[PDB]
Amino acid sequence: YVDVGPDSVKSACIEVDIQQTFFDKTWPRPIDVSKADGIIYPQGRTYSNITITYQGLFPYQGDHGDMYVYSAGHATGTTPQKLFVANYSQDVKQFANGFVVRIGAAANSTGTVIISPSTSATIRKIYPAFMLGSSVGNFSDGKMGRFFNHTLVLLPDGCGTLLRAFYCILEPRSGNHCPAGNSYTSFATYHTPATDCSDGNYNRNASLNSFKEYFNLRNCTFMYTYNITEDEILEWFGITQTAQGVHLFSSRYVDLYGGNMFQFATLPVYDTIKYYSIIPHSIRSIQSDRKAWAAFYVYKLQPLTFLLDFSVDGYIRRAIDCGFNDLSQLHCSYESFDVESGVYSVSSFEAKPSGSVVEQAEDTKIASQLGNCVEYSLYGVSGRGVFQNCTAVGVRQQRFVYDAYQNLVGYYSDDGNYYCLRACVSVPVSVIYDKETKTHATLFGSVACEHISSTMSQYSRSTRSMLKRRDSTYGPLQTPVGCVLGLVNSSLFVEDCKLPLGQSLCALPDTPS
Amino acid sequence: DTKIASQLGNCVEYSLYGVSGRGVFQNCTAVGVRQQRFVYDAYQNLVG
Ligand SMILES: *[C@@H]1O[C@H](CO)[C@@H](O[C@@H]2O[C@H](CO)[C@@H](O)[C@H](O)[C@H]2NC(C)=O)[C@H](O)[C@H]1NC(C)=O
Ligand SMILES: *[C@@H]1O[C@H](CO)[C@@H](O[C@@H]2O[C@H](CO)[C@@H](O)[C@H](O)[C@H]2NC(C)=O)[C@H](O)[C@H]1NC(C)=O
Ligand SMILES: *[C@@H]1O[C@H](CO)[C@@H](O[C@@H]2O[C@H](CO)[C@@H](O)[C@H](O)[C@H]2NC(C)=O)[C@H](O)[C@H]1NC(C)=O
Ligand SMILES: *[C@@H]1O[C@H](CO)[C@@H](O)[C@H](O)[C@H]1NC(C)=O
Ligand SMILES: *[C@@H]1O[C@H](CO)[C@@H](O)[C@H](O)[C@H]1NC(C)=O
Ligand SMILES: *[C@@H]1O[C@H](CO)[C@@H](O)[C@H](O)[C@H]1NC(C)=O
Ligand SMILES: *[C@@H]1O[C@H](CO)[C@@H](O)[C@H](O)[C@H]1NC(C)=O
Ligand SMILES: *[C@@H]1O[C@H](CO)[C@@H](O)[C@H](O)[C@H]1NC(C)=O
Ligand SMILES: *[C@@H]1O[C@H](CO)[C@@H](O)[C@H](O)[C@H]1NC(C)=O
Ligand SMILES: *[C@@H]1O[C@H](CO)[C@@H](O)[C@H](O)[C@H]1NC(C)=O
Numbered sequence: 284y285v286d287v288g289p290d291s292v293k294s295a296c297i298e299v300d301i302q303q304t305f306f307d308k309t310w311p312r313p314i315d316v317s318k319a320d321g322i323i324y325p326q327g328r329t330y331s332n333i334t335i336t337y338q339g340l341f342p343y344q345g346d347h348g349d350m351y352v353y354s355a356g357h358a359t360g361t362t363p364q365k366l367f368v369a370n371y372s373q374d375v376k377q378f379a380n381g382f383v384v385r386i387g388a389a390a391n392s393t394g395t396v397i398i399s400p401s402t403s404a405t406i407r408k409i410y411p412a413f414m415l416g417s418s419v420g421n422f423s424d425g426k427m428g429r430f431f432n433h434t435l436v437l438l439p440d441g442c443g444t445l446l447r448a449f450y451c452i453l454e455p456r457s458g459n460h461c462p463a464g465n466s467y468t469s470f471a472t473y474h475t476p477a478t479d480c481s482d483g484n485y486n487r488n489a490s491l492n493s494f495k496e497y498f499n500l501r502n503c504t505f506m507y508t509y510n511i512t513e514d515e516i517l518e519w520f521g522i523t524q525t526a527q528g529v530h531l532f533s534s535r536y537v538d539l540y541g542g543n544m545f546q547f548a549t550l551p552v553y554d555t556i557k558y559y560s561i562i563p564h565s566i567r568s569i570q571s572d573r574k575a576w577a578a579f580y581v582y583k584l585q586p587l588t589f590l591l592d593f594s595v596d597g598y599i600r601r602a603i604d605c606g607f608n609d610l611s612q613l614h615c616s617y618e619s620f621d622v623e624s625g626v627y628s629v630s631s632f633e634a635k636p637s638g639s640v641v642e643q644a645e646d647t648k649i650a651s652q653l654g655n656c657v658e659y660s661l662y663g664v665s666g667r668g669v670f671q672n673c674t675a676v677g678v679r680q681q682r683f684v685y686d687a688y689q690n691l692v693g694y695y696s697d698d699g700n701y702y703c704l705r706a707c708v709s710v711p712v713s714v715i716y717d718k719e720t721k722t723h724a725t726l727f728g729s730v731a732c733e734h735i736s737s738t739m740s741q742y743s744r745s746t747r748s749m750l751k752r753r754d755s756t757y758g759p760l761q762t763p764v765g766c767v768l769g770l771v772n773s774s775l776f777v778e779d780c781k782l783p784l785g786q787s788l789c790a791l792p793d794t795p796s
Numbered sequence: 797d798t799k800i801a802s803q804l805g806n807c808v809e810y811s812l813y814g815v816s817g818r819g820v821f822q823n824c825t826a827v828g829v830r831q832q833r834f835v836y837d838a839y840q841n842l843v844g
């Protein structure tokens with residue numbers, strides 16, 4: 284196995300007090316895909332200044348992410364005391380095709396101490412620590428997140444210039460405040476700047492040794508290290524897993540200023556990762572020496588399609604999440620960032636299922652429910668649709684009435700009533716796009732505004748919020764063609780809008796640029 | 797193995813780290829991104 288070095292020496296662990304309510308903050312950072320935030324550059328290829336579609340794992344454009352903040356522990360006077368940290372060790376998550384993170388984005392600005400926030404200390408970048416693996420379970424005290432068998436460990440040591448990776452078995456310890464003890468609270472790791480990080484001798488084993496004090500390393504099968512140099516600039520990092528093993532990505536090695544990720548390293552492990560957590564960490568520094576740290580963020584990858592704008596220097600500079608909006612769908616269909624003005628069809632709202640209705644004599648109370656769009660089963664016949672009470676058509680006791688295209692038309696219930704079936708209905712959608720002002724509006728077709736609402740329970744695509752930027756303040760407007768959003772009743776007469784809606788309707792642009 | 801590292805050239809068969817095809821090479825300017833090694837167009841033809 285790997286030569287891990289010496290075992291832990293002290294038996295007792297420094298106590299970990301959970302102060303998690305101090306860490307509740309709301310500093311969201313949604314992905315800006317027009318800036319190419321979070322984009323993993325494609326593997327093995329590069330391109331010219333041409334725009335191409337691409338498919339791969341990416342963050343959603345609308346995701347605000349998850350936020351975590353490292354902070355100094357308790358100290359008083361001129362000396363260190365006990366840790367006062369966040370409860371992040373209990374935040375077990377299901378792994379889901381990797382994740383990406385944002386690090387140091389609040390650099391060269393100020394924030395607060397958090398644990399004693401009134402001091403208002405300036406903030407600086409700090410690197411994250413992580414643990415990954417195939418299984419989790421209870422600590423002997425019932426605490427969440429104990430990993431089993433072998434797990435990944437990623438930790439910086441001391442100052443951010445050294446990074447280590449491990450695939451190893453963790454071992455519980457019988458010391459006071461440690462995992463086999465009944466005095467255990469929660470796992471944490473720490474750095475002590477009062478003796479660590481000398482400028483002529485940075486302590487390369489600093490965080491690993493504090494890690495060893497809570498878990499003895501055993502049976503380690505892999506270890507790696509990497510070299511980093513200090514730089515307060517914002518950075519991107521992330522993890523994916525394939526049948527070739529885990530991949531590590533960073534923007535630092537290749538594209539430090541543009542922020543595009545590149546495949547920095549790979550790992551030999553072939554075990555599937557099923558769970559993910561963040562290791563909490565804290566600074567042991569003296570009370571007058573405290574320093575606030577920049578916020579850390581996490582976003583989750585999904586197998587999304589995107590337009591990618593490539594620079595002549597091959598950097599991705601802009602991108603569009605195709606499924607984010609109906610307008611984004613339009614751009615992807617024309618493979619461009621500048622669609623010509625017009626009225627364009629976009630995908631329709633579907634239906635929205637309703638709770639099931641079942642009849643099969645031979646469970647309650649679903650015998651009938653008229654009715655909207657409730658899934659159904661009738662003596663092994665199934666489908667989704669709306670039922671209505673109707674007349675009586677021949678022939679009775681054949682039970683299922685059908686049309687010439689073999690669509691079910693209606694049904695004889697065992698309550699003696701004929702009901703008819705219309706399947707379900709949908710709302711067609713189109714958008715009005717004015718390229719000159721870069722503005723838009725929408726049309727719901729013949730649906731009528733009695734079925735239209737500010738939010739949707741159908742549905743089609745994840746948001747329509749760009750319309751809502753003006754339409755949070757207005758009711759839907761009925762027109763002879765149909766219900767529309769953000770149209771306004773100006774009652775103007777004009778010869779040609781270059782955006783006719785059909786009929787005598789006309790969609791004037793707001794006054795020209 | 798030698799001496800076939802470069803030959804400019806008209807339409808010589810080639811192999812580049814397991815990528816292969818036939819074509820002419822020319823000493824032109826550089827382009828982004830560096831260290832992705834293979835430059836391609838929108839139809840996935842190798843460009844450079
Ligand atoms: C790279 O794309 C740019 C456009 O983004 C192209 O630049 C155009 O070049 C023509 C020259 O015939 C000009 O008339 C246009 O005004 C330019 N567009 C601009 C400046 O936006 C350029 O040809 C492309 N180069 C390659 C190698 O594909
Ligand atoms: C990574 O950075 C370290 C410096 O932190 C380099 O390792 C040291 O290089 C000096 C050169 O004189 C030696 O005196 C030290 O003994 C080295 N330390 C160790 C632990 O070997 C190292 O070269 C850099 N690169 C890599 C790939 O590790
Ligand atoms: C905080 O300080 C960093 C220092 O790393 C500054 O980053 C500069 O970012 C610009 C962006 O174009 C680069 O051109 C400079 O080279 C960077 N300075 C360096 C590397 O010393 C930046 O002024 C501050 N803010 C952020 C967010 O990084
Ligand atoms: C840790 O704190 C978070 C705060 O959002 C909470 O949701 C979570 O349940 C906590 N973990 C526990 C109580 O195990
Ligand atoms: C931890 O123990 C509880 C019982 O207190 C159990 O319900 C839970 O499933 C256990 N955790 C895991 C990951 O199985
Ligand atoms: C470790 O992996 C084995 C492999 O099957 C699994 O059965 C077991 O639940 C895991 N955990 C422990 C504590 O052995
Ligand atoms: C691996 O870990 C087991 C614990 O289950 C330990 O007993 C064994 O000595 C280790 N073996 C080697 C060869 O690393
Ligand atoms: C519709 O069903 C009602 C009971 O809900 C019944 O009284 C009525 O006769 C039915 N209408 C017909 C058969 O036209
Ligand atoms: C719009 O303006 C005209 C002006 O006469 C008015 O008659 C009409 O009721 C208004 N509203 C709608 C929904 O068309
Ligand atoms: C062409 O190649 C020569 C060497 O064969 C080199 O010196 C020169 O810089 C190249 N021309 C470029 C890169 O434009």
